[PDB]
Amino acid sequence: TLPAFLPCELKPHGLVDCNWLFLKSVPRFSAAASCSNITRLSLISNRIHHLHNSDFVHLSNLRQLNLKWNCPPTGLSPLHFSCHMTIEPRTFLAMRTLEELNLSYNGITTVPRLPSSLVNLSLSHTNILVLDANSLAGLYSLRVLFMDGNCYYKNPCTGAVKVTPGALLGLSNLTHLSLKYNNLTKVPRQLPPSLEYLLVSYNLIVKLGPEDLANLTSLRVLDVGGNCRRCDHAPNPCIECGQKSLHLHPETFHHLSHLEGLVLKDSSLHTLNSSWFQGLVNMSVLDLSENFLYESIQHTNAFQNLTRLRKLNLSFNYRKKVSFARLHLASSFKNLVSLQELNMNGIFFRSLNKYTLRWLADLPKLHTLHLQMNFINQAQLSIFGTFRALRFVDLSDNRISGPSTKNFMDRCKNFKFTMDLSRNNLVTIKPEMFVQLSRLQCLSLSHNSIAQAVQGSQFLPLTNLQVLDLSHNKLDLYHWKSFSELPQLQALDLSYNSQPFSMKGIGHNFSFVAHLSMLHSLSLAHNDIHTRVSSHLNSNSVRFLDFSGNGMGRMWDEGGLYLHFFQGLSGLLKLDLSQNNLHILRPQNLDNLPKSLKLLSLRDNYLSFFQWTSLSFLPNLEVLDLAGNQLKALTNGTLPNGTLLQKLDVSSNSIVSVVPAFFALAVELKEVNLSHNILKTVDRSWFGPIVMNLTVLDVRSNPLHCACGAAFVDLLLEVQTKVPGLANGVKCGSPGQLQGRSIFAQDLRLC
Amino acid sequence: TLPAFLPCELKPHGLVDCNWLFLKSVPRFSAAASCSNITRLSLISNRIHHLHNSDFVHLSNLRQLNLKWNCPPTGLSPLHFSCHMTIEPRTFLAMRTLEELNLSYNGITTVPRLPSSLVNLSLSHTNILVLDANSLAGLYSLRVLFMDGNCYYKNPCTGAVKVTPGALLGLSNLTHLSLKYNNLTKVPRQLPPSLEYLLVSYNLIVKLGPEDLANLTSLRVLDVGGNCRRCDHAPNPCIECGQKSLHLHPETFHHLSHLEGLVLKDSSLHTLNSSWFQGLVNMSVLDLSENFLYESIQHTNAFQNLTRLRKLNLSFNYRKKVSFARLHLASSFKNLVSLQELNMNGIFFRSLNKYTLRWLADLPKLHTLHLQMNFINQAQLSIFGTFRALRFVDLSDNRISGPSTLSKNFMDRCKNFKFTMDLSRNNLVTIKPEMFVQLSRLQCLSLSHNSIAQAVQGSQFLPLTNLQVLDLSHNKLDLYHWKSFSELPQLQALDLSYNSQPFSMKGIGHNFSFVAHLSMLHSLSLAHNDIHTRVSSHLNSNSVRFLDFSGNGMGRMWDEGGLYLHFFQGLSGLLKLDLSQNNLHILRPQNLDNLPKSLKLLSLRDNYLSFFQWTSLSFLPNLEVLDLAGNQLKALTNGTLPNGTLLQKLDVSSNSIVSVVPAFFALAVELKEVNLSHNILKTVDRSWFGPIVMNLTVLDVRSNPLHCACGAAFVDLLLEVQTKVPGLANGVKCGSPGQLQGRSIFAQDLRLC
DNA sequence: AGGCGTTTTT
DNA sequence: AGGCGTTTTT
DNA sequence: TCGC
DNA sequence: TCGC
Ligand SMILES: *[C@@H]1O[C@H](CO)[C@@H](O[C@@H]2O[C@H](CO)[C@@H](O[C@@H]3O[C@H](CO)[C@@H](O)[C@H](O)[C@@H]3O)[C@H](O)[C@H]2NC(C)=O)[C@H](O)[C@H]1NC(C)=O
Ligand SMILES: *[C@@H]1O[C@H](CO)[C@@H](O[C@@H]2O[C@H](CO)[C@@H](O[C@@H]3O[C@H](CO)[C@@H](O)[C@H](O)[C@@H]3O)[C@H](O)[C@H]2NC(C)=O)[C@H](O)[C@H]1NC(C)=O
Ligand SMILES: *[C@@H]1O[C@H](CO)[C@@H](O[C@@H]2O[C@H](CO)[C@@H](O)[C@H](O)[C@H]2NC(C)=O)[C@H](O)[C@H]1NC(C)=O
Ligand SMILES: *[C@@H]1O[C@H](CO)[C@@H](O[C@@H]2O[C@H](CO)[C@@H](O)[C@H](O)[C@H]2NC(C)=O)[C@H](O)[C@H]1NC(C)=O
Ligand SMILES: *[C@@H]1O[C@H](CO)[C@@H](O[C@@H]2O[C@H](CO)[C@@H](O)[C@H](O)[C@H]2NC(C)=O)[C@H](O)[C@H]1NC(C)=O
Ligand SMILES: *[C@@H]1O[C@H](CO)[C@@H](O[C@@H]2O[C@H](CO)[C@@H](O)[C@H](O)[C@H]2NC(C)=O)[C@H](O)[C@H]1NC(C)=O
Ligand SMILES: *[C@@H]1O[C@H](CO)[C@@H](O[C@@H]2O[C@H](CO)[C@@H](O)[C@H](O)[C@H]2NC(C)=O)[C@H](O)[C@H]1NC(C)=O
Ligand SMILES: *[C@@H]1O[C@H](CO)[C@@H](O[C@@H]2O[C@H](CO)[C@@H](O)[C@H](O)[C@H]2NC(C)=O)[C@H](O)[C@H]1NC(C)=O
Numbered sequence A: 001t002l003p004a005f006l007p008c009e010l011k012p013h014g015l016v017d018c019n020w021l022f023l024k025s026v027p028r029f030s031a032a033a034s035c036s037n038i039t040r041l042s043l044i045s046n047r048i049h050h051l052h053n054s055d056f057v058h059l060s061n062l063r064q065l066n067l068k069w070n071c072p073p074t075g076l077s078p079l080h081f082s083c084h085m086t087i088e089p090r091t092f093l094a095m096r097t098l099e100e101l102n103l104s105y106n107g108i109t110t111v112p113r114l115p116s117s118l119v120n121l122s123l124s125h126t127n128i129l130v131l132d133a134n135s136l137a138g139l140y141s142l143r144v145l146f147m148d149g150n151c152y153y154k155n156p157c158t159g160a161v162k163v164t165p166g167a168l169l170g171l172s173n174l175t176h177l178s179l180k181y182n183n184l185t186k187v188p189r190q191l192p193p194s195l196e197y198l199l200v201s202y203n204l205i206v207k208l209g210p211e212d213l214a215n216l217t218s219l220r221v222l223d224v225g226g227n228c229r230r231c232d233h234a235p236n237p238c239i240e241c242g243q244k245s246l247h248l249h250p251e252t253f254h255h256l257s258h259l260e261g262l263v264l265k266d267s268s269l270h271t272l273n274s275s276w277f278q279g280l281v282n283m284s285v286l287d288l289s290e291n292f293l294y295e296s297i298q299h300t301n302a303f304q305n306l307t308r309l310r311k312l313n314l315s316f317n318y319r320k321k322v323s324f325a326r327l328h329l330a331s332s333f334k335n336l337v338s339l340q341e342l343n344m345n346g347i348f349f350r351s352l353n354k355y356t357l358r359w360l361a362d363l364p365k366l367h368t369l370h371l372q373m374n375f376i377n378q379a380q381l382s383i384f385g386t387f388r389a390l391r392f393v394d395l396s397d398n399r400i401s402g403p404s405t406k407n408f409m410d411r412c413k414n415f416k417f418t419m420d421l422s423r424n425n426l427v428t429i430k431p432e433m434f435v436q437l438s439r440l441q442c443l444s445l446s447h448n449s450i451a452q453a454v455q456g457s458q459f460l461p462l463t464n465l466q467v468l469d470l471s472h473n474k475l476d477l478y479h480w481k482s483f484s485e486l487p488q489l490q491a492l493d494l495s496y497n498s499q500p501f502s503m504k505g506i507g508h509n510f511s512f513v514a515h516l517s518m519l520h521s522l523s524l525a526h527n528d529i530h531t532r533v534s535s536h537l538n539s540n541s542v543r544f545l546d547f548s549g550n551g552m553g554r555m556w557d558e559g560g561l562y563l564h565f566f567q568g569l570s571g572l573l574k575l576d577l578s579q580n581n582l583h584i585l586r587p588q589n590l591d592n593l594p595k596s597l598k599l600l601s602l603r604d605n606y607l608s609f610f611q612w613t614s615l616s617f618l619p620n621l622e623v624l625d626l627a628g629n630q631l632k633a634l635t636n637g638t639l640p641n642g643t644l645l646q647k648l649d650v651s652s653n654s655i656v657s658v659v660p661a662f663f664a665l666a667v668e669l670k671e672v673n674l675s676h677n678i679l680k681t682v683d684r685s686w687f688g689p690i691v692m693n694l695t696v697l698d699v700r701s702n703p704l705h706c707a708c709g710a711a712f713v714d715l716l717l718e719v720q721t722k723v724p725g726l727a728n729g730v731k732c733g734s735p736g737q738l739q740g741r742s743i744f745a746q747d748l749r750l751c
Numbered sequence B: 001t002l003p004a005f006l007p008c009e010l011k012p013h014g015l016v017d018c019n020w021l022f023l024k025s026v027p028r029f030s031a032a033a034s035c036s037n038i039t040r041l042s043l044i045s046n047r048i049h050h051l052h053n054s055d056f057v058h059l060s061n062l063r064q065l066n067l068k069w070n071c072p073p074t075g076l077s078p079l080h081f082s083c084h085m086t087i088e089p090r091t092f093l094a095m096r097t098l099e100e101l102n103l104s105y106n107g108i109t110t111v112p113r114l115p116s117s118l119v120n121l122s123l124s125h126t127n128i129l130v131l132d133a134n135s136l137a138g139l140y141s142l143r144v145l146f147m148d149g150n151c152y153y154k155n156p157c158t159g160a161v162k163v164t165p166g167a168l169l170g171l172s173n174l175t176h177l178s179l180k181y182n183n184l185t186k187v188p189r190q191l192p193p194s195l196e197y198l199l200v201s202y203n204l205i206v207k208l209g210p211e212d213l214a215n216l217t218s219l220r221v222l223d224v225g226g227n228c229r230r231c232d233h234a235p236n237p238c239i240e241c242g243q244k245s246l247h248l249h250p251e252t253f254h255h256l257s258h259l260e261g262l263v264l265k266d267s268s269l270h271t272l273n274s275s276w277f278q279g280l281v282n283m284s285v286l287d288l289s290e291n292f293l294y295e296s297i298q299h300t301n302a303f304q305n306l307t308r309l310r311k312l313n314l315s316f317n318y319r320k321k322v323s324f325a326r327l328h329l330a331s332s333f334k335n336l337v338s339l340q341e342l343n344m345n346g347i348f349f350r351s352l353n354k355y356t357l358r359w360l361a362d363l364p365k366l367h368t369l370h371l372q373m374n375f376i377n378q379a380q381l382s383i384f385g386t387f388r389a390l391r392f393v394d395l396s397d398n399r400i401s402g403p404s405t406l407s408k409n410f411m412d413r414c415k416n417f418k419f420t421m422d423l424s425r426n427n428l429v430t431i432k433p434e435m436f437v438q439l440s441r442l443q444c445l446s447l448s449h450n451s452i453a454q455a456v457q458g459s460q461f462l463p464l465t466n467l468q469v470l471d472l473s474h475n476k477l478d479l480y481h482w483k484s485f486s487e488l489p490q491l492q493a494l495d496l497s498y499n500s501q502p503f504s505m506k507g508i509g510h511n512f513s514f515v516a517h518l519s520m521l522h523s524l525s526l527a528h529n530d531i532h533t534r535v536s537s538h539l540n541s542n543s544v545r546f547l548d549f550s551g552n553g554m555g556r557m558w559d560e561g562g563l564y565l566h567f568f569q570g571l572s573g574l575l576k577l578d579l580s581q582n583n584l585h586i587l588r589p590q591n592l593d594n595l596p597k598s599l600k601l602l603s604l605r606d607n608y609l610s611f612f613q614w615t616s617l618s619f620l621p622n623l624e625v626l627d628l629a630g631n632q633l634k635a636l637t638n639g640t641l642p643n644g645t646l647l648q649k650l651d652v653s654s655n656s657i658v659s660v661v662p663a664f665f666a667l668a669v670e671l672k673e674v675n676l677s678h679n680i681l682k683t684v685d686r687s688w689f690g691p692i693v694m695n696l697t698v699l700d701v702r703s704n705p706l707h708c709a710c711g712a713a714f715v716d717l718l719l720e721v722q723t724k725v726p727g728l729a730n731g732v733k734c735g736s737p738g739q740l741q742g743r744s745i746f747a748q749d750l751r752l753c
Numbered sequence C, D: 001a002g003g004c005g006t007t008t009t010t
Numbered sequence E, F: 001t002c003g004c
């Protein structure tokens, strides 16, 4: 019965998870029959500061071992405690087929001895400051070596990490090397020619030429960015570059015939020399972000031959203290025929018209365009209508205000054509701002300042639009023709348009909902809807209504005025009534919800009583969420006979008891969440036979009484596969010595 | 020791408070030595459905008794349970000096017999449908009678309540009568001439003349509103009036020589007849709201003789489905020389011209003007500069967007001020200094809840040379230029809260260096701004005393190496700092040590702290108040309050505190209030405090799962400090053992054991 | 001695 | 039987 | 981190 | 509960 790898948790393919258990030593698993099947062990963020020769002898088949964060270096310790990890010399040699080891975020100053089998090692965020030819001796199979972050502001050293010339040459299967944030002044010498990925960003390598990348002819990805930073844009401490620019020899990259990815971000480059990219037929991903290329991208020839480039990042190439009236991409962009994604965020230019992006408009595969954070105040959005293959254009966080002079957007991820105009300065919508954008399927105007009694004339051209996010505006819902000019509209988010609904004395009107014939998903959430609105919603199409964060409590206190508010939503399948200040809920109010309802959320209300037989008025209910209410027990009835309920969430209540056979008639029941309540026990007699059909039974954060004979232990073991965090997350509230500890910290059957 | 009016709570001036204890009967107070000094008893919202002759015999000196909500009528019951209250006949006669009784929200159908001494009775929201000459017999001293709400949508009846002719005549000291929401078709006949206040609103009295107010010449206040309602404005079920208008005889009120207050709201009036107000020299308060007087107020002579009118409500006199281009108040308004307050909310007119309120501009005592919810899109704000005594003008909830083209709430600081304007909830996107011409006298201005998206830089507020308070909360201000707000020489309180959107732009930074140039600034809020990255690393000031920084990301800022380590330090003199809801998962000593040494109040409410090193309080030498509520503390440990600490209040409520280390509080000589509520304490120990427990003014231990075992030690402590523990009598409850879960620590006696 | 705590990337 | 719960005014 |  |  006992899970067998206590205090850890056994998981799928040979993985034992011991993360976050505050262990001071490698667990012995004494009362397991065999540790021979254990091939992966995770000990993340425990407190193991001392490792011994005998610690892994019983785990001799491990292939994967994670020891991250056991002994954090000073700068990474939340309280800046120094930690020094000791490792006896033969500690890891007992695992003769170990393939992957993570020692990151540990206070070690030298590499311990490791087995020949090792393939992937991380020494990142440690205090190892020298790698010489003895550091990783004999690791002939090593393919991947991370040692990032051993000398920077969060894990400081006085000088720099040193990688001696030829130190890694003996690692002749090494393909991936990462040595970022180490204060290096040069690319280490005589690196293994087998390298395909070299990352040396955020060091102090202010000069590069071909000699620094000698014999590395197998490189596919090279990241040399952040070595001459522009600190005006840094979000973190930033080391001032000694020069105006990274010095890059013209022929630096010419011998890297296989190169596919190059990162030159944050290099303080004021010009592009096309010879950098010459002879790289497979250059696919280029990052030029956070440089000073604002003029260069309007003039350069450097893109002429980049005919296989797929992704290009030009973001935050802004001029200090300036925005530009206009920006015109250079004609050489016309050659980027393979280009799928371009990032032009944060260059800072005030008008967007046909000349800005002219040379992108005929590229046959440009799908994705980022134009955020540019202080754009005039935009001829019509230009996007003749682009060859646009799927997503993001103009969010600009200053567009009109024509030129649970996240709803997840629904749009594989759409034909989505535009994001959120976080702009729109106060009214004029249909002319949409000329030539008839192909749009999805549009966000969220987080604008739209304060308008919409009435059918705002969105005239958008005859293909299926999704519209208008959340976080100040829309006045009043005229019945609102949104009826959108013939294909299926999802409409009107959440966080609360301000008008808070006007005491001015009413509103939802009769428009009845005229939206394709509308399937509607949010009216967080609108402060509480008084002076229409008394009936009506639809034949709406299937999901989010009414979270309103005042239905107050509405259902107004005599019968709002008694049939949801009733005319024929076919409604899901209704969210969370956070509606409900202090009671009458049977008549549930009986007048649509009979089609499969999901009702009452999360985070103030219900301290619930009449369970009233679930018979929701014949089709499969999911009921009553979490965050004030239920004192599960009582005043039982789940009623015939109920189709599949999930009941009654977490985060004040439940102290459950009545006999409470769950027993709910034949379809699969999930029950009882967590964060005040149960002293868990009883088979609450469920009867249906406990064996449950897929999840969550009983964490209950103050379970762990006295010696305790009965619940046998129940939880019988369904152990179905109770999340059983091994160490289900804890006792009493007696005193066991408060806050696992129900398995004592054995409560052996006594 | 035991409080001895258990389970109730004894309060000052003979009040015993038994509210909300779910009692099914009048408590006996057996344990009390004497119940003779009990003069007031409150039993609100208990479950007493049956009252007996013997219930009140020990409480024979009661002067006030409140029994409301004990037996709710069906319509008012939250679950629509029917309730019938039984009352034995001599029940209230045991209290021969009873002066005030509240029987409201109880299912009674008959008035019980009452003592002669009674002065104030409420029978509201009951099921009494008839008052006849026997209902209130012998109550010669009765001054006040409320019986509102016995026949309306929330407490329905079949017909209407009936007050039979002359039923109340024998109550010849009766001064206040209220009979609202009763479905009356007429004012009851032969009411007592002693009446000074008569309220008959929200019935169906569609017709009134002098005959209906016969012989009531002592009236000071008459409320006849809501008898012919306009249902287009109702927030609740509304009965359609049978007529276009309430029918009001011209001389209805003429004989009410002493009348001071008249309510004609929601009467469907399309005209005013001046004869209504004639002969009423002391008319002070007039409510004409929710009528159809949109034309009438631009033309009528009705205000000519209202020379003592102080308050006038014209609100929501709008035309159905219409807003007006313009509006001119009638010249008769010029005569309202006593007028202090005028409410013109919700008429719906789009321009506010210099002329619109021309006839108000010379009234010598007009202090307060309400112009909300009018769909005003053009406004000549300059006119308010010429008004003779304006103290507050409210233009909130309109559509103003700029200068005219025509020819914890910071504003609470402004309630005594000489001149405040509220422009909140308008459509401003940029501020132009010209919108402020002639408003140089303004001391307070709200622009909150607009859409202002502007890199303020010193030129926005030029005319406002006397402005002390500026509320800019809930906008989209771009804090960047150092000259922001430096044109406001007298600015003392600035609210920049809920301007978060710019701070959420990933890759564009901001700058707070402007704060250093605001030389009078005493109170600043940067709350709920998502301030977390790419901002200036130092705030500086010599004047700022209160900074609200709640709802930001200091957690993330203090995880960026040393970049923000001295963020608050240069606020010299800072006295209060709110760092609640800043996603703090840890605090180092250096973080507290680099707050200004002047600090008296620090809030860390609702963070994620599960450790706190108490010896770090020595680095806050002037601290008097510390709020750590809503964190994840598991105990009070890792130090004790240090010697010399000036701490007065410590709130550690709503944590997960299971233990307190010995003498944790002992050296805090100044300590007065400690909140330990909503934790997981099984006990409360004198040894946590030592002798300073006697100097505490509040020790809050509710919602802890106290172990109520037979000898339990905490009981003696709590009794020793009983006047200092809120809700001791019934609100401090046991978690265990099972028999006592959820019950008062005094439900058993835990010493006799 | 070793605590602290769920730790993106810059 | 009585339960429900903090209940402004409309 | 926002016209010269 | 929001022009003609
Ligand atoms: C990574 O390398 C950089 C650059 O070599 C290191 O920063 C440098 O640290 C030196 C010496 O510690 C600084 O000089 C000092 O300046 C202060 C104040 O101006 C002065 O009081 C001292 O006496 C001394 O002269 C130097 O400015 C600084 N260089 C730069 C460009 O920032 C850095 O410490 C190394 N490690 C890390 C973790 O960054
Ligand atoms: C530029 O990128 C292309 C696209 O990947 C490279 O072409 C590919 O090169 C590899 C060799 O690394 C080919 O795989 C091999 O094919 C041979 C011959 O049939 C086989 O014996 C090997 O087992 C191996 O699978 C791959 O098929 C080939 N693909 C195409 C579409 O040609 C190209 O070589 C790159 N150019 C440079 C200069 O790096
Ligand atoms: C694009 O590639 C072509 C061909 O490699 C480059 O043109 C050659 O440049 C070489 C070296 O400078 C000159 O000696 C020749 O005149 C050119 N060769 C041919 C065959 O024309 C061209 O410069 C590249 N364009 C850019 C902007 O880098
Ligand atoms: C919500 O708006 C609708 C449509 O504008 C209003 O319903 C109509 O009201 C008119 C009179 O104003 C009646 O003649 C129609 O019979 C109504 N139509 C329907 C479908 O009901 C309705 O009054 C508004 N609701 C509220 C509460 O303002
Ligand atoms: C049972 O309910 C608890 C309490 O709501 C759930 O725990 C939350 O999980 C979400 C997502 O994992 C997190 O954002 C929160 O950290 C958790 N909340 C609390 C209060 O701890 C839990 O996941 C539910 N159980 C299952 C199996 O779904
Ligand atoms: C109108 O109100 C005034 C002021 O309240 C009344 O004048 C007072 O009358 C009382 C009688 O109760 C005298 O004691 C005072 O001497 C008067 N006070 C002042 C300041 O003049 C006046 O009687 C009221 N008139 C009517 C007809 O009601
Ligand atoms: C305001 O009061 C004056 C009294 O000064 C009213 O004047 C009287 O009006 C009636 C008919 O309108 C005349 O017959 C009298 O001769 C007038 N008497 C005096 C003494 O002037 C005046 O009508 C009142 N105003 C309003 C609008 O009712
Ligand atoms: C916030 O703004 C201040 C003032 O504009 C910046 O400090 C100035 O920086 C300039 C150069 O850009 C220097 O000449 C001076 O040190 C400062 N000038 C003045 C007038 O005080 C500061 O850089 C900004 N803070 C951040 C983080 O950008």
Ligand SMILES: *[C@@H]1O[C@H](CO)[C@@H](O[C@@H]2O[C@H](CO)[C@@H](O)[C@H](O)[C@H]2NC(C)=O)[C@H](O)[C@H]1NC(C)=O
Binding pocket: B629, B653, B654, B675, B677, B678, B698, B700, B726
């Ligand atoms: C001790 O803290 C508790 C819990 O934070 C306080 O209880 C709150 O009191 C207000 C009073 O208006 C209530 O509206 C809230 O519902 C209470 N919150 C909770 C979670 O119960 C209590 O007031 C504090 N004690 C004192 C004396 O201030």
Ligand SMILES: *[C@@H]1O[C@H](CO)[C@@H](O[C@@H]2O[C@H](CO)[C@@H](O)[C@H](O)[C@H]2NC(C)=O)[C@H](O)[C@H]1NC(C)=O
Binding pocket: B637, B638, C003
């Ligand atoms: C905070 O206080 C706790 C409780 O005293 C400390 O944890 C104890 O520390 C000793 C180490 O000297 C252990 O042997 C105990 O088992 C720990 N007890 C518990 C209940 O955890 C903790 O070290 C203190 N934290 C710091 C940073 O000093």
Ligand SMILES: *[C@@H]1O[C@H](CO)[C@@H](O[C@@H]2O[C@H](CO)[C@@H](O)[C@H](O)[C@H]2NC(C)=O)[C@H](O)[C@H]1NC(C)=O
Binding pocket: A635, A636, D003
């Ligand atoms: C809902 O169930 C609870 C718990 O059993 C009921 O409360 C008990 O009612 C009995 C007799 O009616 C009392 O003697 C107990 O003291 C109550 N127990 C507790 C823990 O409060 C409650 O009456 C039920 N309500 C309804 C409406 O059926």
Ligand SMILES: *[C@@H]1O[C@H](CO)[C@@H](O)[C@H](O)[C@H]1NC(C)=O
Binding pocket: A250, A271, A272, A273, A274, A275
């Ligand atoms: C690029 O490198 C060449 C090498 O001759 C140099 O002369 C030239 O100045 C550079 N050209 C550009 C376009 O930046």
Ligand SMILES: *[C@@H]1O[C@H](CO)[C@@H](O)[C@H](O)[C@H]1NC(C)=O
Binding pocket: B151, B152, B153, B155, B156, B157, B158, B159, B160, B183
């Ligand atoms: C009040 O009067 C109306 C009209 O006579 C009538 O329809 C209704 O029955 C009465 N009761 C209530 C509770 O409104």
Ligand SMILES: *[C@@H]1O[C@H](CO)[C@@H](O)[C@H](O)[C@H]1NC(C)=O
Binding pocket: B250, B271, B272, B273, B274, B275
């Ligand atoms: C007001 O009442 C008088 C009688 O006092 C009547 O003759 C007149 O028509 C009424 N005028 C208005 C404007 O209602």
